[PDB]
Specification:
alpha+beta, Phosphorylase Kinase, domain 1, Transferase(Phosphotransferase), domain 1, 2 domains, 5-stranded antiparallel beta sheet, 3-stranded antiparallel beta sheet, 8 helices, globular, Receptor-type tyrosine-protein kinase FLT3, transferase, Kinase
């Protein structure tokens, strides 16, 4: 298990000159410690091979002496989860990120407590609304919000190695938040991940430099973001629909193959998508760039 949301530290001007920040040697700030008895567990939000994410009510975790809904990450009946915890305590909060609220790490199994998103992952949300088109303005708003969340991550020197609609969650006012919900799903039962030794790769969302060099930068995320845009404006269709993942898929990407304009996208949005898929990472737009284009389109 490992969160795909990771902090990195750039070492050179070249894309591959950076390393991942590992919080294993850092210390956990106990001000985040929450009483596990103040958690009232509800339904399972999703489960997988390593553990699961549970819904629950938390007594007094919020600034007020009120009880609220939260999402609790946990492992199958550890250091990796502690590192994710430490990492999220250092990130700071943002409206378009699923924020950490607390943790239980001392008198029992490790629990990471996050903000709860009542309407599940954005992919299922979109698919559940194919027969009820939610408006185009909402679509543009989801897009703008994800760009803003990614802009925050870029600012905090982080990258998401699995950016996709399945890792974006929806809450009350049509607000979406980026996270890593990998713990809440069985990667083995998800065909969007291709098995390769010890890796489970979301090939159809990967930038060429990630596919062919194992490189992951904020620019690679701009590419994945373009795929996520296609997911939004097609209402949740699998990317490169009908095309299998095999040696020919890799060759297609290498040759510059790009998806067609999805039905709900306008030509301006599609032009943005296409630029996100520039083979050369330098040619792709930046997130602050994308946030403006979209803010404007809005």
């Amino acid at each position: 298990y490992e969160s795909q949301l990771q902090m990195v530290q750039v070492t050179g001007s070249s894309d591959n000159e950076y390393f991942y920040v590992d919080f294993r040697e850092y210390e956990y700030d106990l001000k985040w410690e929450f009483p596990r008895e103040n958690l009232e567990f509800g339904k399972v939000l999703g489960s997988g091979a390593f553990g699961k994410v549970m819904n629950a009510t938390a007594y007094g975790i919020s600034k007020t002496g009120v009880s609220i809904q939260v999402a609790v990450k946990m492992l199958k009946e550890r250091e990796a989860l502690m590192s994710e915890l430490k990492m999220m305590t250092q990130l700071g909060s943002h409206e378009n990120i699923v924020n950490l609220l607390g943790a239980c790490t001392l008198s029992g199994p490790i629990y990471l407590i996050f903000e709860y998103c009542c309407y599940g992952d954005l992919l299922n949300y979109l698919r559940s609304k194919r027969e009820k088109f939610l408006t185009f303005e909402d679509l543009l708003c989801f897009a703008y919000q994800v760009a803003k969340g990614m802009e925050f991550l870029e600012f905090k020197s982080c990258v998401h190695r699995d950016l996709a609609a399945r890792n974006v969650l929806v809450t009350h006012g049509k607000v979406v938040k980026i996270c890593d919900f990998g713990l809440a799903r069985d990667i083995m039962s998800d065909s969007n991940y291709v098995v390769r030794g010890n890796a489970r790769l979301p090939v159809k969302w990967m930038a060429p430099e990630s596919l062919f060099e194992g490189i992951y930068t904020i620019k690679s995320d701009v590419w994945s973001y373009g795929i996520l845009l296609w997911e939004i404006f097609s209402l949740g269709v699998n990317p490169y629909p009908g095309i299998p993942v095999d040696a020919n898929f890799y060759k297609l990407i290498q040759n510059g193959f790009k998806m067609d304009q999805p039905f709900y996208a306008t030509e301006e949005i599609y032009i943005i998508m296409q630029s996100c898929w520039a083979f050369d990472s330098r040619k792709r737009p930046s997130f602050p760039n994308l946030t403006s284009f979209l803010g404007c389109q809005l």
